[PDB]
């Protein structure tokens, strides 16, 4: 296998789990009892670009599906974005900069910096039913942290 | 899932013959294998990590080869003190199981006394650094009920190294329970033991505490305590196990 890809969960600092709201639209809540299983598991693929001991470049998209997260300017604003890239041609190591995630790992909590946009990484608010939106404002009022949990297949 | 497959189950080799021996996994995780070294009777340990790293401490007769989707183990001479179950292992993903195991039997036509020695040296609990883990909790509990696992941590730095908990059946190969971060909110935890366990850390006694609710009978294994040294998730120590079995207490007069 040329590139290698994994399957993970992941969740805020708050222990928030990520759902999908509409066909491109992320929001992240508070997701406990026998409603667990509703969680979104994304596929991180191996690509090219920053790579160290701390930071991991990778891209994020939905399993299963040709839905992959997106880092663009909207209305002079740097704002994230579900694109449905090709089924066929995707996923491929050499991804466009816009889907490549920078994976750091500080302490215990993983940070995503966006590769098209540095020090701008995935942010999701405290409050509950909110949806996900990209902050340069690490660790501030929203949630710049997230956990990893790696599912079977 | 990613499963693993051995070759052969069993062998038999002289006194500094070059055992070999084959792993394979369902995925090509290029280079993420693991081997480890269990004694008959004692606890299990690292010989060699990464692929083709050896273990600071490891006798270097020891060897590893093998890229991709398979794998091989080399013993440049095998030794008496050698025999012993090999079970690879990867991690790279799930569900970070070992493989089917390998073991090596020395044959010797018979020169009397020919065995070996004991284990340890200048220092050895005694006046030195011991590392050492010991779990506790284990017994008979009846099914549906709950245990609470604790693992004694000694000689070494408990906010500075992270560790996690792996299980073992007698007669199976070694699969992991859960992982237990130093920091305090990552937490893996597969599918297949979701919910089935919960765990918890204590820097003041030293101690890990595996909290186990709603347990089966396929839950029935030896409970070792692991622990970690890098950012990748493999063990280079592991502690003497717990037997937890769950049974009814229900029994008549034989």
């Known amino acids: 296998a040329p590139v290698r890809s994994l399957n993970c969960t992941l969740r805020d600092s708050q222990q928030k789990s990520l759902v999908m709201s509409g066909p491109y639209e992320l929001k992240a809540l508070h997701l406990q009892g026998q409603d667990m299983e509703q969680q979104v598991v994304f596929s991180m693929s191996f690509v090219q670009g920053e790579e160290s001991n701390d930071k991991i470049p990778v891209a994020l998209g939905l399993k299963e599906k040709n839905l992959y997260l997106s880092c ?36 215990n909590k993983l940070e995503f910096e966006s590769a098209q946009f540095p020090n701008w990484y995935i942010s999701t608010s405290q409050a509950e039913n909110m949806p996900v939106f990209l902050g340069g404002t690490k660790g501030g009022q929203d949630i710049t942290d997230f956990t990893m949990q790696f599912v079977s297949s | ?154 000689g070494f730095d408990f906010s500075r190294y992270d560790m996690s908990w792996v299980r073992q059946a007698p007669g199976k190969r070694l699969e992991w329970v859960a992982y237990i971060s130093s920091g305090g909110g990552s937490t893996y935890f597969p599918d297949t033991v979701k919910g089935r366990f919960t765990i918890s850390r204590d820097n003041a006694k030293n101690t890990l505490y595996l909290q186990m609710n709603s347990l089966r009978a396929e839950d029935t294994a030896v409970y070792y305590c692991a622990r970690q040294n890098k950012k990748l998730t493999w063990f280079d120590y592991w502690g003497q196990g717990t037997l937890v079995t769950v049974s009814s207490h229900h029994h008549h007069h034989h």
Not at chain 2, 30 to 50: D, E, F, R, S, V
Request: with cysteine.
């Open chain 1, 72 to 107: 663009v300017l909207k209305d002079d604003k740097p704002t994230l974005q579900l694109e449905s890239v090709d089924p066929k041609n995707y996923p491929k190591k050499k991804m466009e900069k816009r889907f490549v995630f920078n994976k750091i790992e500080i302490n």
């Open chain 2, 1 to 154: 899932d990613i499963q693993m497959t051995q070759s052969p189950s069993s062998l038999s080799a002289s006194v500094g013959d070059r055992v070999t021996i084959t792993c394979r996994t369902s995925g090509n995780i290029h280079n993420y294998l693991t081997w480890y070294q269990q004694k008959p009777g004692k606890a299990p340990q690292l010989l060699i990590y990464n692929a083709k790293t050896l273990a600071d401490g490891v006798p270097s007769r020891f060897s590893g080869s093998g890229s991709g989707t398979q794998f091989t183990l080399t013993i440049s001479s095998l030794q008496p003190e050698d025999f012993a179950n090999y079970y690879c292992q990867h991690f790279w993903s799930l569900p970070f199981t070992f493989g089917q195991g390998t073991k090596v039997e020395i044959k010797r036509t018979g020169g009397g006394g020919s065995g070996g020695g004991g284990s340890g040296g200048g220092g050895s609990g005694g006046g030195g650094s011991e590392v050492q883990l010991v779990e506790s909790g284990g017994g008979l509990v009846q099914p549906g009920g709950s245990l609470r696992l604790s693992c004694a941590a000694s």
